[PDB]
Design a protein around this ligand. Structure first.
Ligand SMILES: CCCCCCCCCCCCC/C=C/[C@H](O)[C@H](N)CO
Lengths: 246, 287, 41, 246, 41
């Protein structure tokens, strides 16, 4: 009863047998911006079914030595779908996301992944240089990896210089191969401003880090893909202009 | 009371539906343990998943008519159940006889065989002409010969007096002849498949030709001549069409996949099995 | 409002149309009602 | 709750752990013939517990290449039990059947059988001959195989020249080794006549056809028997006379 | 009304707590299917 579940948004639907409940981040639902909180005076557009729906990205193959991956959400969807086209033609953006991570495996496999939504996730430079002018900075494509995602060098600090053990202070869910085959989290829109640009700013990141490694026996299936599905939810756009993708 | 044990519904019901079903507006659902999508095909029940549950739909009030698909409009169309060849001039001859079977050939047979049981009335129409297609002012006689009535043995036979057997006299140039027939089976329904034998006794494993035949479907014989004392010299062909009306149908079944080899028997040729489909290039490329 | 010219009722026309459906007997011939929104097993 | 189930009729009982629901053919229960539908004027006999009960037939061993089997019901039971003796001494017969098919297998086996009750099932001759006198006809023992049952030559057409894909238009149930270990269907008496002879006529057949073949791994149990259990239900007999078995 | 589809909380709440929580006396329990210890992380 609680294990089984089905979502639906737009024309897309997801069904799960073995799922464990659902995480609603910070106890609030996504909403449209209220009149009091609004600032920009133009009438925002609310596409609904054309934008809000599940989008599936390419799959990551999880291997015994895998170090984990991450994504930036008002990034991955900027070049894909109708959501991506509204984002390039509009200067202002607001929405929440419903997030779903999926990893199958047999009852003979063992391991655990930590799925976490970590707002304002800022990757850092890796090096001992204390001089600000010569200090390393983490690339463009490492900061906004796009649809393909990026992988951690040293997941223990989350590339942020911050302990992964405390990452449970963020909306998070475990996917444990013996318990559940998927993790689901709904994130309301959070930021210091009512709207914000989609192409410049990344509200929050996602982190799938293999805490307990992947282990199995000879003869079992070796290839274990990981797939993420994200639904932009309760979207808004404003500030229409010509397309700027970068 | 002296002994206790001697002291001792359905499921669904039919709804009258005049038009096709409508659609009601729905929105996204996110919650647990409510899943219209997951079904079990093992139970033998078809998926009850609807539109409104799977994705977001608008409010659609459907005016499309459902009427044309009733079985009573599906068989309202006439078809050719038999064609009989009469040559009055050749040798002696003089009459033609056709034992009534609507399995004679395909299109109408394939329709009626998607139900096991059918009860209905019928309407026969006789289109007669020359081998050349031309019409000539000759009078014809169509006599129906119920099971057990003596068949005509010749053109001059006394069988044609028809004090009992119903007849139709019509000239050949006139419009076709048309009659209504009731439901004449001794049973309560016609049945196009009978698994069993008409009689008791031994059933050889060499020639079983008795097998499969249902006597309740034997309506007797239809005979035709041309009325004169002297034998006319002409060739003639009579096509028989039948509407099928006031029809009821029970326990539907699949259509014939394979070409029909025989009239009374569902035989097929096992080397030629057709694999009803069209061949393709691998999978995962659609045309 | 049809008409029959003979006293034998089987000679009549298509008579009156009708709309009746209970696909439930073919679609769901099961003895335990399955709620369409809930897990079958 | 729905998985587990137990039947009972007569002195016989069946219990199932993994069963999936029950099929009631055409939404009607077996009944005795009503006074209006009756024709023959003699008082029919209603044996009840001596006739109505579960009868188990010999088991079929299902092998990787198995092509399927079939039976004819007012046949299999004519030579067995008290039901068979009433059938030989009486000219008239009516009853419904409660049917149960049983195939066990491990969670490491895979495959699927299609169990179907197909009324007035008429096997056909196999050959290209269009002449009615020389055309082949399918034996006596192929038409009424008796208790031992008969096997299909080419199950794809069901020996009837009719596509098996459409066999789902008949009361039917799947037994899928991963889901359920048994299939159950109740069939009311159907025919164009209130009573009919048991030894001449076969009301309906049963078809167990291995759609997806049987597959397993080395070391697993090879022998996988299939067993069918049939309960003549709500029986009636009439037209008493001397015994005729053929 | 001309077209229908155009026709269209949180979870918890905050409690004012001035002092730390108290503790209430409890005793042994022996029964089935009541298990505060088992959790799902
Ligand atoms: C003046 C001629 C009138 C002829 C009236 C005869 C009507 C016959 C009753 C309708 C046909 C019954 C259905 C036929 C059964 C099958 O074709 C075969 N008997 C079985 O193979």
């Amino acid at each position: 009863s609680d294990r089984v579940a089905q979502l639906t948004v737009g024309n897309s639907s997801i069904t799960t047998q073995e799922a464990a409940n659902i995480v609603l981040a910070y106890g609030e639902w996504p909403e449209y911006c209220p009149d009091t909180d609004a600032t920009a005076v133009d009438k925002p557009t609310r596409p609904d079914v054309s934008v809000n729906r599940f989008y599936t990205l390419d799959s990551k193959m999880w291997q015994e030595n895998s170090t984990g991956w991450y994504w930036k959400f008002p990034d991955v969807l900027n070049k894909t779908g109708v959501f991506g086209q509204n984002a390039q033609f509009h200067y202002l953006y607001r929405s929440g996301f419903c997030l779903h991570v999926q990893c199958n495996a047999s009852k003979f496999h063992q391991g655990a992944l930590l799925v976490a939504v970590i707002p304002e996730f800022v990757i850092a430079g890796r090096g001992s240089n204390t001089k600000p002018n010569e200090a390393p900075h983490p690339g463009f494509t490492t900061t906004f990896p796009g649809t393909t995602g990026a992988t951690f060098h040293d997941p223990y600090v989350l590339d942020s210089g911050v302990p992964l053990s405390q990452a449970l202070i963020y909306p998070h869910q475990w996917v444990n191969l013996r318990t559940n085959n998927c993790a689901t989290v709904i994130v309301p829109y959070i930021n210091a401003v009512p709207f914000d640009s989609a192409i410049n700013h990344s509200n929050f990141g996602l982190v799938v880090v293999p805490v307990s490694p992947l282990k199995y026996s000879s003869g079992a299936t070796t290839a274990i893909p990981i797939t993420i599905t994200i639904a932009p939810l309760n979207s808004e756009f404003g500030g229409l202009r010509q397309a700027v993708s970068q | 009371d002296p002994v206790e044990d001697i002291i001792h519904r359905a499921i669904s019901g039919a709804t009258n539906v005049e038009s096709a079903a409508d659609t009601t507006p729905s929105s996204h659902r996110l919650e647990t343990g409510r899943v219209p999508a997951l079904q079990a095909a093992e139970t033998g029940a078809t998926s009850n998943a609807t539109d409104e549950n799977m994705i977001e739909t608008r409010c659609v009030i459907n005016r499309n008519g459902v009427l044309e698909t009733t079985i009573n409009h599906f068989f309202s169309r006439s078809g050719l159940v038999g064609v009989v060849n009469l040559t009055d001039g050749g040798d002696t001859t003089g009459y033609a006889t056709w034992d009534i079977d609507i399995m004679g050939f395909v299109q109408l047979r394939r329709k009626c065989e998607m139900f096991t049981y059918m009860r209905f009335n019928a309407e026969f129409t006789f289109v007669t002409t020359t081998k050349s297609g031309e019409a000539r002012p000759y009078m014809l006689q169509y006599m129906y010969v119920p099971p057990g009535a003596p068949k005509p043995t010749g053109r001059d036979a006394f069988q044609w007096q028809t004090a009992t057997n119903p007849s139709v006299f019509v000239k050949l140039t006139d419009p076709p002849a048309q009659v209504s027939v009731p439901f004449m089976s001794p049973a309560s329904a016609y049945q196009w498949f009978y698994d069993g034998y008409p009689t008791f006794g031994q059933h050889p494993e060499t020639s079983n030709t008795t097998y499969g035949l249902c006597p309740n479907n034997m309506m007797g014989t239809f005979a035709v001549r041309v009325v004169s004392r002297e034998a006319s010299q002409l060739k003639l062909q009579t096509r028989v069409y039948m509407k099928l009306k006031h029809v009821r149908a029970w326990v539907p079944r699949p259509i014939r996949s394979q070409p029909y080899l025989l009239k009374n028997f569902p035989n097929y040729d096992s080397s030629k099995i057709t694999n009803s489909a069209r061949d393709r290039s691998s999978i995962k490329q659609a045309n | 409002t049809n008409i029959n010219y003979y006293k034998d009722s089987y000679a009549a026309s298509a008579t009156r149309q009708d709309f009746t459906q209970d696909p439930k007997k073919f679609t769901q011939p099961v003895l335990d009602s399955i709620r369409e929104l809930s897990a079958p097993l």
